[PDB]
Each structure stands twice: as structure tokens, then as C-alpha cells.
């Protein structure tokens, strides 16, 4: 009757609010981890562009020899 | 995505840096610099018509950005439309199959400012996905673009010295601390105004030519000479004394004070020290030689945690009867400027006053050349949420 | 070519509004401005190379 | 989720933290006081006040907006504070978005009228279309993931101890202490005053000192004794003699040095005097004789435990003591939580303490704001009480 309904509604409200708050905590951790990971991947892009353009500068420095002739 | 179709727009209070397409060899300085202004023709019945030129002297001049803030969101969006349609017309005239190759899918990256409203960014999102019909959008923060052009440092501080304002932005864990982002209403014009106070007999143009002269530096050989000669914009030779070593000091002191009061409120001291060790100073005003080193030295003078020289002197006198160092509990023992990327040739050639834009050349190589759509809104995400999809793709 | 035709020919679709909305349980006694999905029935070119730096 | 976006404003006793519901970190953290500049000028925000406190101009007076009870008392300057929030920081109209505000846990009497004031501040003045009120210990205990919890919020106004059983706040056992961050500001000022040449209306300079270097003393120099101080000395000598005899020093005599900036001077304190300030939060009888040992946090927690027994008592005791949550900015000081664990286990030796705490430095300062943030984005409007304009239209009639 009217008592079972109220008790079950209170229990469902409690469990549902706990569930959605745990979901938002997982969202917090996921967004922060994605920020750290994509920043550290941008650093790896920096390192790769460094290695490529250093190889280019070394070839041009070695190469200037042909120009010197 | 095709790297020829990557479009980057960086608008400011005065100008706007535009680049359509990456070089694929090395990253280049932006060639297109359009001043952020539009023309508002007030049509009878009340409606507005926006133009690139003053249409028959019926239009007023609307500058959509001042001090980094968007003050007219519709004029800003239609000025973005003017830039984008100009790029479409240029590529369609040049290539004439561009709408199948170069214009068939244009990812847009608009570099944003901290002072822009959330409602303003949502209107920008609605405008990009409806009016311009652009299928994809990154709204990049300017401070995060600065720290992604710098070596992708986890903790840093951004000093953006503009023309009439200076932005102070701490970045902890690749994220912007919005409750500590501040701005002083004071920038490159205060160097000018200090030189107006120190040199009354000149006008605005001679003092601006002094600020843009090679002989204007801040001490922290030009420094050996008492007088030195520069040239006017009209080619007139003008001599100046010690006033070419002055004028910047008040800006440096106020920036040092605001950076100190900003970074003393970082409660995690381990994050705070790594912020203090990675001071990043950007702006066209920062193209003045010796400005960044003098601001670093003023941070060292005002906020470095060291034993007082008088107490160390008394203690060294007590030792004359080896000196250990007083270890303090204060965070800011080491203050450093962050190490600049010395591997971009064109950016070394043209200077790093606009290095923020360089981060957009890196991030749009990151996200737009990799299948993950985590940080740009797709047409899928827009058809799901609208401008509310902007807050699922933020950094 | 025309600006609207340059836009429409490029980058190839719903529209969204900033409107008052009343949520339902029925209807809540308030409203709030939010981004609502629109239903079915709901200029110039500057020349480049003038601002190309040279 | 719901197609909405809420404004989340937290009015603490020292910090007012305001932001949106689509973000995890706030748009602004301003102080909960204001500088009257004198025509009148009410200076709002962090950087605008401190610079005005650095100007040291006459007529500049820091007036607080939230008292020791956690409730507002100056509603017009709070109104102008929220106008400063919606205009300079949030940059949005208060008519457009729903609002979520916070209240501290009370005993039951002051709520309704302040509710009416909230009505009179949201409806008659801001025209907020609907606003939600959440309870700050309920928001802290519920955003961590509990419906029965024992909340200990050590803030600036004092220590707030609140039992919560299955989502409802046990109101008769809500006990608010007085010793907190502002008390430690006064103690640090009064003790360092002969070393810094120092020793309402001068609340500009008092607030400026409490906001620049006394907080730097609190975050770096202060350490909370995990046991009682004399009991720490006994236990630490008892440990160190075991180490010295097992292999074949006083831990208090470690000198900690504070670089005081307005005089450029080293302030050298041993670790006992670093413990001493935090000893008055738990033993307030060491400054004066008008304060009982019951007035400290030590028994008071347990006192707030025992009134929860008459909300059968020994089950409520275990339900609270297995769900102890420690929060607050003043509780960011090193060693605060272990003193709560030991000082609460010596008054309940039977029960095992499982204390949970948000270990992030920033997130414990804004933990009530984060609780209201989790309460703002709830995907059902029936999960919280949303006072629309009809509620204050009903409260007007008789």
C-alpha cells in the first residue's frame, strides 16, 4: 500500500543518487587522465619533430660541402 | 583529415593570424594578418549588413575584440565568416577543384581567449556548425596553445603582454586554473606612456618608433654608449640618451606583483614550484630585447625564497671564529623561464612573440591527423547536443 | 563566387536554439534558458595578398 | 542527462566559490568579505581587494558577509556580490539558468526565514527562475558517495560536526565549533607579532595579513600533532630510546624557518611551536580558562556522536564511525586527519575507524562547492527540492 511505495521510493532515490555520483567521479578521473595522456603525447610529437628537423639540419650542414666545392 | 584543409584562426584585439594548410616539412610563421574589424551598415527596418570595406560611407567600424574580450559576438562571427569565405574564394580561384579536395572537408581550429563568455563560445559553436557549415571545430585556449608550443610542460605560467592589457594565467596539470586567471589593464602602451612622461618633446610616432627601434633594450654595445641614434618611420634620424633603457619598469613591476599574488594561491606546493620554474612570457610587446630577462630578474628580486643577505652576512661573520644554508619551507626557491623550442627554423627566424599560434600548428597536427574525435565537435556530436556538445570536448 | 554558395559547396545537419524550456515530470512550474533542438520548420569577400606579410 | 546548465554558488565563511555545472573547476574563488571604499564603493573579488588592501587607503573597511554560523547576514552586499558573480565572472544573466546554493547543517530553527531571504534574493532581486538549496555536510557526504556519514568540516569559522543517517541530517547532533582557520590566523598573528615588529575598522590590514602571509604560514609552517602534544613528546622519546638502544634525538628541536616578506626576515621556530597553534583547536584550555576541553574538537565529535544515538545507539555509533569524512581547508594542514582518528578512537576504543578523505589539496577547499556541483547535474528534477517562484508565491499568503 502507501507505506511500501514510500519506503521503496526513498531507497531508489538513495541508490540512484549514489550511482550517478559514482558515475560523475569516474568521469572526473577519466577526463583528468585524458588531459595527462594527450599532454604527454604532445611532448612525444615535440620529440619526433626535434629528431626529424635535427636530421635535416645535419644533412644541410654536411651538404654545404658541395656548395663550397 | 587532409592537412591542406586545416584552418587556424587566432584573433586578437588588434589583428588576427590566419593559416590555411600545413607545410608538412616544418612549421611556418603565419602569413595572413587581418585586423579584427568589420563594417556595420545599418539598414532601414533595423537590420545589419556586415562588410569588408566601408560601403559608400554608410557603415560604421566595429572592432569585435578589445582587450582580448569579445564585445560584439555577431560581428566577430561574421568577421570569421569574412575570413573563411575569403579563403574559400581564394582556393576556389586558385585550384578550381578545391571543393572536392581542399574545401571538401575543412576542420576549423579557433584559438579562444580566457575572457570569452561561455554563452559567447556556444554562439560561436552554433555559428560554425550552422552558418559556416563547418563540420568540425576545436576551440583551443590561448594559454594551452602557448604551453603546447612550449615543450608540453605539465605546470607553467603564461604572461601574455598585449597592447593595453597583460594576461596572467597559471596552468596546472595541462588545465587552466580559471579562479586564478587575472589580467592587469596594462600592456605595451604603458611603455609608450612612460616614454611620453620621460620625453615630453616627442610625439606618439617618434616614441613608438623608439619602442620599435633596435636600440631599445632593458638592462638587467648599446649599454656602453650614452647617446645613440635611431630612425623615424619617415626616415628622420633621432638621437636619444638613457631613455632607451627605461620606460618598461612599471609594467615589469606590476606583472611581477600580479604573478606573485597569483602563484602564491596555488595550495599544492609541488605543483606551484613547477609552475614557478616554467614562466612563459608571450606577446608582441615582449619582442623588446631584454624585457623577458628583466621580468625574470624582477621575479627573482621580489619573490625568490632565499636567505636575506644581511642574515647570511652576520652568520658568515659568526663562522669566522663553512656556512650551511638556511632551508626555508617556502615553495618558490627556484624561478626559471621555461625553455624555448629551438628547433623550429621559421619560428626562430621570425621570433617567438607569436608562439601561441605555433601550438595550434602542433595540436592540429595532433588531433586532426589522428582518428580520435575526443576534443573536436563532430556533426554527430552537434546533431546530438548542439552548442552543449562543446563541454564534452574541452581540455 | 557567392559567399553562401562558397559556404554551402564547402564542407560536404540540425540547427539549435537558445530558448526557454520547461521540463516535465507533469510540467515543472519554472522555465530555464537552454539549448533546444530545432524541429523541421524551425556578403563580402576581402582580397588576400593585401595582408600577406612581405 | 538533462538538457540544462546550472549556476553553482557556494557562500562559505571565508571563501565564496562560484562556477557553472558544465565544469569541474570553478570560474571564480573570491573572498566572502568586501572592502567598503569611501560615496560608497564595495570592492569585490580576490585581486581587486588585495590591491585595495595594498593601497592602504582610509575608509577601506573589510566587512564579512557570512558569519560563524555559515549563513549570510548582510544580504544587500551579498546581492551585489552575486551581481559581481553573474556579471564579471560568470558572465550570464541570472534569469536564464537554474541555480544551486548551499546551506550548512543547522539544528532546525534558522532555515525557513533564510529560505525566504533566498527567495527574496533569487526571485524579487535576481529573478532566478528556479534555485535548489543543498545542505553542505549532506553535499560533502553525498558527493563522496555516502548517505550515512560523519562529516567533520574544519573551516575558517570553526569545526562543523554533522551526523547523517541514510540521507537525512541528524539535526540535534549537528554541533558547530568556533575554533578554525580565523582563530589560527589570530594565534599566528599574536605569536609571530614580537618577531615581525607588530606587537571592524583596521580589518583591511588584518584581512590583508591573514590573506597574504598568515595563510602562507598555515600552508607551510603549521603541522597538526597526530597525538596529544605532551603525549607526542612521551611517545617520541619512547620510540627514539628504542632506536638508540637497538642500534647501540628530540624531534621537537627541528628548526623550521619562515621567510617573512614585509621585513625580509627569517622566523625560526622549533617543531613544538609549530604544533602549538594546532593544539588550541583540540585543547582550547591552553590559551584561557574560560574554554573547556569539551570545547575542542576532541570530545565534541564524540558528543555529536552521542546525541545521534538518541536520533539502537551503539549501531548508530558504528554507522557513523565507519563513515567518517574529514574535509575543510583548515584540515589541509599536515597531521589533522590522524589527530581526528586517534582522538576519536580514544573515546571509542571498541569500534574500528575507516576515515575517508578527498586527498586533493584544492578539492578539499571547494568540497562544498563540489557537493553542490554534483547536486546540480542530477538527471532527475525530483532528486532535490527545486524552489521555483510558485514556492515564494505560496509563502506570501499568511
Swiss-Prot record, chain A:
Protein's cellular compartments: Nucleus
**Domain HSA span(s) in chain numbering:** 1-69
Q: What else is known?
A: Present with 1990 molecules/cell in log phase SD medium.
Q: What does this protein do?
A: Catalytic component of the chromatin structure-remodeling complex (RSC), which is involved in transcription regulation and nucleosome positioning. RSC is responsible for the transfer of a histone octamer from a nucleosome core particle to naked DNA. The reaction requires ATP and involves an activated RSC-nucleosome intermediate. Remodeling reaction also involves DNA translocation, DNA twist and conformational change.
* Record text on subunit structure and interactions: Interacts directly with SFH1, CSE4, histones H3, H4 and H2B, and via its N-terminus, with RSC8. Interacts with LDB7, NPL6 and RTT102. Component of the two forms of the RSC complex composed of at least either RSC1 or RSC2, and ARP7, ARP9, LDB7, NPL6, RSC3, RSC30, RSC4, RSC58, RSC6, RSC8, RSC9, SFH1, STH1, HTL1 and probably RTT102. The complexes interact with histone and histone variant components of centromeric chromatin.
Report the family membership: Belongs to the SNF2/RAD54 helicase family.
The protein in question is named: Nuclear protein STH1/NPS1
* Shown stretch of the complete protein: 314 to 382 of 1359
UniProtKB/Swiss-Prot annotation, chain B:
Keyword vocabulary terms for this entry: Chromatin regulator, Nucleus, Transcription, Transcription regulation
Q: Which GO terms describe its cellular component?
A: chromatin; nucleus; RSC-type complex; SWI/SNF complex
Q: Which GO terms describe its molecular function?
A: structural molecule activity
Gene Ontology BP annotations: chromatin organization; chromatin remodeling; nucleosome disassembly; positive regulation of transcription by RNA polymerase II; regulation of DNA-templated transcription; regulation of transcription by RNA polymerase II; transcription elongation by RNA polymerase II
Q: What is the effect of changing residue 283 to V?
A: Impaired heterodimerization with ARP7
Question: By its UniProt entry, which InterPro entries does this protein fall under?
Answer: Actin, ATPase_NBD
Whether Transcription regulation counts among this entry's keywords is: yes
Task: List the subcellular locations.
Answer: Nucleus
The record's Gene3D superfamilies line, in alphabetical order, gives: 3.30.420.40, 3.90.640.60
- Miscellaneous section: Present with 1790 molecules/cell in log phase SD medium.
Q: What does this protein do?
A: Component of the chromatin structure remodeling complex (RSC), which is involved in transcription regulation and nucleosome positioning. RSC is responsible for the transfer of a histone octamer from a nucleosome core particle to naked DNA. The reaction requires ATP and involves an activated RSC-nucleosome intermediate. Remodeling reaction also involves DNA translocation, DNA twist and conformational change.
What is the similarity comment for this entry? Belongs to the actin family.
- Protein name as annotated: Actin-like protein ARP9
UniProtKB/Swiss-Prot annotation, chain C:
Complete protein: which residues are present? Answer: 1 to 90 of 157
The gene from which this protein is expressed is RTT102
Q: What else is known?
A: Present with 1550 molecules/cell in log phase SD medium.
The record's subcellular location field reads: Nucleus
What organism does this protein naturally occur in?
A: Saccharomyces cerevisiae (strain ATCC 204508 / S288c)
Protein name, entry field: Regulator of Ty1 transposition protein 102
Quaternary assembly: Interacts with STH1 and SWI3. Component of the two forms of the RSC complex composed of at least either RSC1 or RSC2, and ARP7, ARP9, LDB7, NPL6, RSC3, RSC30, RSC4, RSC58, RSC6, RSC8, RSC9, SFH1, STH1, HTL1 and probably RTT102. The complexes interact with histone and histone variant components of centromeric chromatin. Probable additional component of the SWI/SNF global transcription activator complex.
The record describes the protein's role as:
Probable component of the chromatin structure-remodeling complex (RSC) which is involved in transcription regulation and nucleosome positioning. RSC is responsible for the transfer of a histone octamer from a nucleosome core particle to naked DNA. The reaction requires ATP and involves an activated RSC-nucleosome intermediate. Remodeling reaction also involves DNA translocation, DNA twist and conformational change.
Curated annotation (Swiss-Prot), chain D:
Query: Where in or outside the cell is it found?
Result: Nucleus
User: Biological process GO terms, please?
Assistant: chromatin organization; chromatin remodeling; nucleosome disassembly; positive regulation of transcription by RNA polymerase II; regulation of DNA-templated transcription; regulation of transcription by RNA polymerase II; transcription elongation by RNA polymerase II
Q: Which domain of life is it from?
A: Eukaryota
* SMART domains tied to this protein: ACTIN
Q: Which GO terms describe its cellular component?
A: chromatin; NuA4 histone acetyltransferase complex; nucleus; RSC-type complex; SWI/SNF complex
Q: Any additional notes? A: Present with 1360 molecules/cell in log phase SD medium.
Consequence of changing residue 18 to P: Impaired heterodimerization with ARP9. Temperature-sensitive phenotype. Moderate suppressor of Ty phenotype
**Record protein name field:** Actin-related protein 7
Q: Which InterPro entries does this UniProt record tie to the protein?
A: Actin (IPR004000), ATPase_NBD (IPR043129)
* Entry coiled-coil feature ranges: none
Query: What Gene Ontology molecular function terms does this protein carry?
Result: chromatin binding; structural molecule activity
NAD: present as a keyword of the record? Answer: no
State the UniProt keywords alphabetically: Chromatin regulator, Nucleus, Transcription, Transcription regulation
Q: Which organism is it from?
A: Saccharomyces cerevisiae (strain ATCC 204508 / S288c) (Baker's yeast)
* Subunit comment: Forms a heterodimer with ARP9. Interacts with NPL6. Component of the two forms of the RSC complex composed of at least either RSC1 or RSC2, and ARP7, ARP9, LDB7, NPL6, RSC3, RSC30, RSC4, RSC58, RSC6, RSC8, RSC9, SFH1, STH1, HTL1 and probably RTT102. The complexes interact with histone and histone variant components of centromeric chromatin. Component of the SWI/SNF global transcription activator complex.
Q: Which family does it belong to?
A: Belongs to the actin family.
Predominant subcellular localization, coarse grouping: nucleus
A Pfam family cross-referenced in the UniProt record is Actin
Amino acid at each position: 500500500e502507501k507505506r511500501k511505495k514510500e519506503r521503496n521510493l526513498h531507497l531508489q532515490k538513495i541508490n540512484s543518487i549514489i550511482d550517478f555520483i559514482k558515475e560523475r567521479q569516474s568521469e572526473q578521473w577519466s577526463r583528468q587522465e585524458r588531459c595527462f595522456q594527450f599532454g604527454r603525447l604532445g611532448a612525444s610529437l615535440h620529440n619526433q619533430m626535434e629528431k626529424d628537423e635535427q636530421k635535416r639540419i645535419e644533412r644541410t650542414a654536411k651538404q654545404r660541402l658541395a656548395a663550397l666545392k | 583529415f587532409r592537412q591542406d584543409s586545416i584552418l587556424i584562426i587566432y584573433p586578437r584585439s588588434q589583428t588576427t593570424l590566419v593559416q590555411f594548410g600545413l607545410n608538412e616539412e616544418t612549421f611556418t610563421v603565419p602569413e595572413l594578418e587581418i585586423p579584427t574589424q568589420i563594417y556595420r551598415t545599418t539598414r532601414q527596418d533595423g537590420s545589419y549588413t556586415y562588410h569588408s570595406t566601408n560601403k559608400d560611407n554608410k557603415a560604421e567600424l566595429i572592432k569585435p575584440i578589445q582587450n582580448g574580450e569579445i564585445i560584439d559576438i555577431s560581428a566577430f562571427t561574421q568577421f570569421l565568416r569574412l575570413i573563411f569565405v575569403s579563403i574559400l574564394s581564394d582556393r576556389a580561384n586558385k585550384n578550381q577543384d578545391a571543393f572536392e579536395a581542399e574545401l571538401s572537408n575543412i576542420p576549423l581550429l579557433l584559438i579562444t581567449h580566457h575572457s570569452w563568455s561561455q554563452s559567447d563560445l556556444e554562439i560561436i559553436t552554433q555559428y560554425v556548425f550552422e552558418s559556416l557549415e563547418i563540420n568540425n571545430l576545436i576551440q583551443l585556449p590561448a594559454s594551452l596553445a602557448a604551453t603546447y608550443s612550449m615543450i608540453s610542460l605539465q605546470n607553467c605560467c603564461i604572461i601574455d603582454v598585449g597592447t593595453h592589457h597583460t594576461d596572467i594565467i597559471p596552468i596546472v596539470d595541462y588545465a587552466q586554473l580559471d579562479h586564478l586567471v587575472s589580467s592587469i589593464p596594462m600592456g605595451g602602451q604603458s611603455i609608450n606612456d612612460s616614454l611620453k612622461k620621460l620625453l615630453p618633446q616627442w610625439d606618439d610616432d617618434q616614441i613608438e618608433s623608439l619602442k620599435k627601434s633596435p636600440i631599445f633594450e632593458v638592462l638587467s654595445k648599446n649599454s656602453d654608449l650614452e647617446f645613440n641614434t635611431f630612425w623615424d618611420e619617415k626616415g628622420n634620424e633621432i638621437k636619444v640618451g638613457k631613455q632607451r633603457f627605461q620606460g618598461c619598469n612599471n609594467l615589469i613591476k606590476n606583472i611581477s606583483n600580479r604573478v606573485g599574488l597569483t602563484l602564491d594561491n596555488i595550495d599544492d606546493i609541488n605543483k606551484a614550484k613547477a609552475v614557478w620554474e616554467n614562466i612563459i612570457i608571450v606577446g608582441g610587446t615582449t619582442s623588446i630585447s631584454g624585457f623577458k630577462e628583466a621580468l625574470l630578474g624582477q621575479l627573482l628580486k621580489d619573490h625568490l625564497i632565499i636567505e636575506p643577505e644581511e642574515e647570511k652576512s652576520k652568520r658568515e661573520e659568526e663562522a669566522k671564529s663553512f656556512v650551511p644554508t638556511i632551508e626555508y619551507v617556502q615553495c618558490p626557491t627556484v624561478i626559471k623561464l621555461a625553455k624555448y623550442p629551438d628547433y623550429f627554423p621559421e619560428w626562430k627566424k621570425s621570433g617567438y612573440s607569436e608562439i601561441i599560434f605555433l601550438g595550434a600548428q602542433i595540436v592540429s597536427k595532433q588531433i586532426f591527423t589522428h582518428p580520435k574525435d575526443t576534443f573536436y565537435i563532430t556533426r554527430e556530436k552537434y546533431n546530438m547536443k548542439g552548442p552543449a556538445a562543446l563541454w564534452d570536448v574541452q581540455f | 563566387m557567392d559567399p553562401q554558395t562558397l559556404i554551402t559547396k564547402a564542407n560536404k545537419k540540425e540547427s539549435w536554439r537558445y530558448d526557454w524550456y520547461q521540463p516535465s515530470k507533469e510540467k515543472y512550474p519554472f522555465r530555464y534558458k537552454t539549448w533546444l533542438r530545432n524541429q523541421e520548420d524551425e556578403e563580402d569577400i576581402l582580397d588576400l595578398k593585401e595582408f600577406d606579410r612581405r | 542527462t538533462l538538457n540544462r546548465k546550472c549556476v553553482v554558488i557556494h557562500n562559505g565563511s571565508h571563501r565564496t566559490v562560484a562556477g557553472f555545472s558544465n565544469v569541474e573547476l570553478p570560474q571564480c574563488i573570491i573572498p566572502s568579505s568586501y572592502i567598503k571604499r569611501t560615496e560608497a564603493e564595495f570592492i569585490f573579488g580576490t585581486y581587486n581587494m588585495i590591491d585595495a588592501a595594498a593601497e592602504k587607503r582610509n575608509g577601506d573597511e573589510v566587512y564579512t558577509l557570512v558569519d560563524s554560523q555559515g549563513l549570510p547576514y548582510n544580504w544587500d552586499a551579498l546581492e551585489m556580490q552575486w551581481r559581481y558573480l553573474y556579471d564579471t565572472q560568470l558572465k550570464v544573466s541570472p534569469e536564464e539558468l537554474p541555480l544551486v546554493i548551499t546551506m550548512p547543517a543547522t539544528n532546525g530553527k534558522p532555515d525557513m526565514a533564510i529560505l525566504e531571504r533566498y527567495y527574496e534574493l533569487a526571485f524579487d532581486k535576481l529573478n532566478v527562475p528556479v534555485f535548489q538549496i543543498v545542505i553542505e555536510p549532506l553535499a560533502i557526504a553525498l558527493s563522496m558517495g555516502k548517505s550515512s556519514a560523519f562529516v567533520i568540516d574544519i573551516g575558517a569559522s570553526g569545526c562543523n560536526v554533522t551526523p547523517i543517517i541514510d540521507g537525512i541530517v541528524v539535526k540535534n547532533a549537528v554541533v558547530r565549533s568556533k575554533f578554525g582557520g580565523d582563530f589560527l590566523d589570530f594565534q599566528v598573528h599574536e605569536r609571530l607579532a614580537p618577531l615581525i615588529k607588530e606587537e571592524q575598522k583596521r580589518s583591511t590590514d588584518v584581512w590583508y595579513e591573514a590573506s597574504t602571509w598568515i595563510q602562507q604560514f598555515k600552508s607551510t609552517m603549521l603541522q597538526v600533532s597526530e597525538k596529544d602534544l605532551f603525549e607526542l613528546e612521551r611517545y617520541y622519546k619512547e620510540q627514539a630510546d628504542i632506536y638508540a638502544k637497538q642500534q647501540e634525538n628530540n624531534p621537537l628541536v627541528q628548526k623550521k624557518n619562515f621567510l617573512f616578506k614585509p621585513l625580509n626576515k627569517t622566523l625560526t621556530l622549533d617543531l613544538k611551536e609549530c604544533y602549538q597553534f594546532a593544539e588550541y583547536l583540540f585543547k582550547p584550555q591552553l590559551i584561557s580558562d574560560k574554554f573547556s576541553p569539551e570545547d575542542g574538537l576532541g570530545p565534541l565529535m564524540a558528543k555529536s556522536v552521542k546525541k545521534a544515538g538518541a536520533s539502537s545507539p551503539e549501531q548508530v555509533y558504528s554507522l557513523l564511525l565507519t563513515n567518517v569524512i574529514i574535509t575543510g581547508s583548515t584540515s589541509l594542514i599536515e597531521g589533522m586527519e590522524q589527530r581526528i582518528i586517534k582522538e576519536l578512537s580514544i573515546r571509542f576504543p571498541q569500534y574500528k575507524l575507516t576515515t575517508f578523505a578527498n586527498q586533493v589539496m584544492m578539492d578539499r577547499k571547494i568540497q562544498g562547492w563540489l557537493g553542490a556541483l554534483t547536486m546540480a547535474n542530477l538527471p532527475s528534477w525530483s532528486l532535490g527540492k527545486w524552489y521555483s517562484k510558485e514556492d515564494y508565491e505560496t509563502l506570501k499568503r499568511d
